[model samples]
Target: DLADRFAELERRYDARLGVYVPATGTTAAIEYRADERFAFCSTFKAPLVAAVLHQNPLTHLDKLITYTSDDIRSISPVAQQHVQTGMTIGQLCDAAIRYSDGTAANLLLADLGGPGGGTAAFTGYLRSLGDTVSRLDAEAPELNRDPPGDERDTTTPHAIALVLQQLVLGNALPPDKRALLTDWMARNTTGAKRIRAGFPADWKVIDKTGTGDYGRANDIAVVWSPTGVPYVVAVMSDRAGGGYDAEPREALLAEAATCVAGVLA
Candidate 1:
């Protein structure tokens, strides 16, 4: 059974694993750390999106916000991409989350709070869920932080699971807000082959991915088995040993994630 397998897995990996199955509406979770701390990578985007809606003036009733293909140049709010045209805040928000578009995300980071304001907003939201280890834009202010190289967004798998649990319980936001969150997560552009490969082909995964150190592998997501099972998961590691080592990390990720999914199966 997955329960026993995951227990064994906890002993073997010496790492952390957290799962929140939405269908069961259980925050039934596990962990490897005393605190919820790890670079959030792009998974930070989850809370970022939530915060955007929570704090920003944008409403669910607003028309879609989007960024032009040229406007979406970088994901970091501090890093400016060569945006050629204008996009709606709604469209930009959609692209930022649905595609994990770096350019679009950073832009929203600016609009909602700017740089670390977005990061701070996200971390604060996590804390509301009893997630203690989550931190964003550590030293710099929210408007000034950049996640890829300069900063590491921190949070633990447990925090992520808790966040998902809140969403499942209709406690995170308004129904329209929750629905939008789920809708965009299903369209997330990261972890396509990584965690998605773990479930049965018929399963649906609405998850997010975060890559740092140039794709050294950082992924987090909420999963839904077509059979009506759902889980919120997080995977963060030092696959980033250093120096632009990406291919190996991606390979390792595919293998590790598939194995875990197989066990849970």
Candidate 2:
């Protein structure tokens, strides 16, 4: 029934909506086009930051990295501010996740290994976490190029949901590092109008959002019911023939989240 509801919602928006919500103790899992590929967009930054935290020492978070105008992208609001003073690894992690800062992500990628190597490194990190369905072929900005039919920088809803589960609730990272990742996601400034909009004020949510060309709007999150059970949800959608200016259908994502909440209840 929920699958049919998602299908109807997709029809209403004239977009392909892919969702994967893992089961909780009280709820059944929901999957609609869960294996379909969707452009990752900025959503990859969350895991990128998580990998950085996991592969290095805790003291690494304090190491400051500097950048210049040449390193900036079209949407580097947080990184642009620190161009003069530089930012710590911790700050970069926060910027990439909380602000969706492109430069911060690219810089972290460079630290992992430059553009080419970084993509491979991040992809390898995903594999280490048991994710075989997601792939990262490029760095930020370029990586957001999600043309129809292209699988580069793409992920299945189910795959990404599993990644979020491992990083947030599983053993992918140690407690401190995991707490750092969750803190950044929980405080994210970019998702208020997306998945977070669907939950009641009392419910807690940790999420990451992505927006790109072709109406690609995505959010992957871990939602905690007031009863303390947690659900992993990944929602990604894109409209046919829609471009950068196309409506991201944020409300559709919220509606989907609402549907999930209702079903879980």
Candidate 3:
């Protein structure tokens, strides 16, 4: 059973790990230290996109946006590739989610309101949804440039799970808008070695990846099973041994994700 599987995984994961899987029809869930806060890093981008989409519709994502020196702040390899001109809103989102493009996120942050604007908009949205455990105060540049132990933004497994649930299952977005979100996340190559690594070739995992200094790696996802049951998973770890290598941590995420998927299946 999932209970036993997770119990065993807990032993293997000694640092800090959070997991939340809602029951079939009840509001209750299966959780393991899910409320404990961790440095969210780029995982905050998940809420950024949701807030942006909730305020603006699908039509707004296609509006053109130019690139500036400020946009090229954090980890934006794709944005760097096209730093000459600019891309549409949707294109920036694609780069942000799919490639973890720092420039794209910085651009989106400016659109959401500057560094403070995006944080304000996202925090406001989360508060309205009854989520109090997440805080977003820093932009991508600060996050990436922070010292080893610094965590600009903080979030919990439960908060991230709630974010995903509200965006994917709640009335915050229409079907098409939700579909757009899923489509963008599904194309994410950034998390390919993390949450998506846990699943088989046939299953679809829509997720976002967060990595920062001090060996922080987080992946929040909604997994859709072939048998019809779907579930949400948020895994975060900081102070892990490695710096940026995707070894045991990603493998651990995959193991737990597959176990959770099995239970959902």
Candidate 4:
């Protein structure tokens, strides 16, 4: 029943899509083309956050990163206004995760050692988790804030799902770091209109929302169902016909996650 529902949802979508609901005892019913690649946009920040923490724990996260005029780009929602000229690494990561701040992400990437260093750290972390297919090329315009929709950084839905699974299981990161990232996501406000749209008001949604100009609207979340069921859901899409229409695209994600909730509920 769950498979049929998501399958119909997939067919109705105009862009590439991947969804994974791990509650089903059988793997087939829990995933849909999850291994297929798609431009992850800001959704990539979750893994990047994990990577940064993997190398530098909570103590190091307080290190500060200053925003130069060069660091300023028109793309970020959180860091754009720049009420302050500088913030701690912890702050940057928070902005990136909670606000989907592109400037914060780029600064964190550059502060970690630019494309060569930051990208390698994230990709290596993914590889250690046996995710051989995902790619993170930070030099790509998308990751670096040169512009949006570069399509350079890519990952499979399954790969991202595994990352969330590892975090939840406390396999890849220590308990403190895992708590840090998950907490940041739980407080995230960016996806309220997307994955969180139809969820019960009392339910908790910890998510990262990603949007790129090239018809991409992506959201990956860990939802605590009103019934106390915990699940990880990721819905990603690109290549829409008339560009990204926020209303229907987000509605699709809301419906997708809500369907998963219904199965668990």
For each candidate in turn, the TM-score is 0.71, 0.96, 0.86, 0.85
When summed lDDT is taken over every stretch of 10 residues in candidate 2, the lowest stretch is 239-248
Candidate 3 clash pair list: 75-102
Best by TM-score: 2
Clashes of each: 19, 0, 1, 0
Rank by TM-score, descending? 2, 3, 4, 1
Which lDDT tens digits does candidate 3 get at residues 7-97? 6765675435567775557334767768776777787776677777777877898798877665575778778877666788888888888
In model 3, the Cα lDDT at residue 145 comes to: 34
In model 1, the runs with Cα more than 4 Å from the true position are 1-36, 56-84, 114-116, 138-152, 168-170, 242-248
Tens digits of per-residue lDDT for model 4 on 1-265? 7667766776777555678765534223467778777666788787778777878857888786667656666456767666466778888888888987777877777766574477766677788778787777763245422223344577778878777777754478889898898999988988988778857787878889877654667888887756665777888765455454433367667877777667665
Residue 241 error for model 4, in Å?
Answer: 4.4
Q: Runs in model 2 with CA error above 4 Å?
A: 243-245
Cα RMSD of predicted structure 2: 1.3
Comparing 3 with 4 on lDDT, the higher-scoring candidate is 3
Query: What lDDT score is found at residue 181 in candidate 1?
Result: 76
- Per residue, candidate 1 scores C-alpha lDDT tens digits across 1-265 of 6555544544454333333332343543434441434456556666667776766554542644444454434453422342444556666666666666666666666665554576566667777766676677632123223333343566656666667667643477777778877888887665677677666677777777665543335566666656766665555543333344433244344444565566455
Clashing pairs for model 4 are none
Query: How many clashes does the backbone of model 1 have?
Result: 19
